[PDB]
Amino acid sequence: MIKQRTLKRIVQATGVGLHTGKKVTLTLRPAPANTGVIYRRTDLNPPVDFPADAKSVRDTMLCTCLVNEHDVRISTVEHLNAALAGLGIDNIVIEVNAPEIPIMDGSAAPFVYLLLDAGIDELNCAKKFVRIKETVRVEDGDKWAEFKPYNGFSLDFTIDFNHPAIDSSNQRYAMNFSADAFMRQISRARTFGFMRDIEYLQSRGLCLGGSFDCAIVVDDYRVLNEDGLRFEDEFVRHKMLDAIGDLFMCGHNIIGAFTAYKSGHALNNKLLQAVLAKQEAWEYVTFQDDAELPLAFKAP
C-alpha cells in the first residue's frame, strides 16, 4: 500500500519576509495521518491555523496567501508548498512567527534541504490521489488552463513574455513530474520582478525584504543580477514551480495532464476549484498495490 508521509522530526530555518523585510523563523513539524497541510501563524496570540485548501487561496499582488474566516492571512506559501509536492509530503504543520513564509532565495530549493533534514515517516494510511477522469478547462480572456485524463502527472506551461531578457525559445516548458525532476529541473528556479515596480513598492513601505538575493530582477532591458540566470529559461521554470505549488493547495497529488497558456496563480486556482467542484470530473484513488503507482509519484 502506498502510504501517506509526514516528517520524522521538527526542523527550523530563519530568513527574511518578502513583505516585512524582518527575520522570520520557520518551524516544520510532523503531523498525523489525514490531517493534511496546515500553515500556522504564531506571531498572533492565540496562534491561527490555515489549512491548505483551494477555496482559501488568494492571489495577492506579491505571491499568494491563505485566508481564514476573518480574512486574517498567511502569505508567500506557494514555493514551500511546491516543495511539499516535490518530496511527497502529505501531512505537516508549518509555523511562522510572522505573517509570511520567508522568501529565502526566491526558489523552492532551500525548502528541499530543510525537508530532507526533517526526514520521512511513512504513516499506516493509504495516500489518496485525485485522478482526473474528465477534461476540465477554465479561461480568463486569452489565458487558459486545463486538466485532461492521463495516467501520470505532466505539466505543459507556456508563458507569454515580451521582455527583451526572455527569448522566444524560452517561453514554454514541459515536463513529466517526478520528485527527482522537480528537485533538479524546477526547485532552484527563482521568482522574478520588475525593478521599477519593486522600487515603487519599497517606497510605500512594501516588499521590504526584496533583494537580489531573493529574486531575478529586470529593468526594461536586462537581468540586473550580477550572475545572471541559473537556467536560460528560468522564468518559465519558475512559473511551473508556482503551478505545482498552486495545484498542491488541495493537499493531494493529481493524476492527470496539466496544460496552461499565460496562466498564473488565479487561473491555476480557478482550474483546481473547477475540477474539485465537478464531482464526476475526478475521483480519489489509492494504490493498495504499490506497482500500480504512476512513475510520476514514486518516492524521491
Ligand SMILES: C[C@@H](O)[C@H](NC(=O)c1ccc(C#CC#Cc2ccccc2)cc1)C(=O)NO
Ligand atoms: C513571479 C510572480 O508570479 C510572483 N513573484 C512576486 O510576486 C514577487 C514580487 C517581487 C519580488 C522581488 C524583489 C526584489 C528586489 C530587490 C532587488 C534589488 C534591490 C532592491 C530590491 C519577488 C517576487 C511569484 O513567484 N509567485 O509565486
Ligand SMILES: C#Cc1ccc(C(=O)N[C@H](C(=O)N=O)[C@@H](C)O)cc1
Ligand atoms: C503598487 C503597485 C504596482 C503594481 C503593478 C505595476 C505595473 O503594472 N507596472 C508596469 C509594468 O510594466 N510592470 O512590469 C509599468 C507601470 O511599469 C505598477 C505598480
Ligand SMILES: [Zn+2]
Ligand atoms: Zn513564485
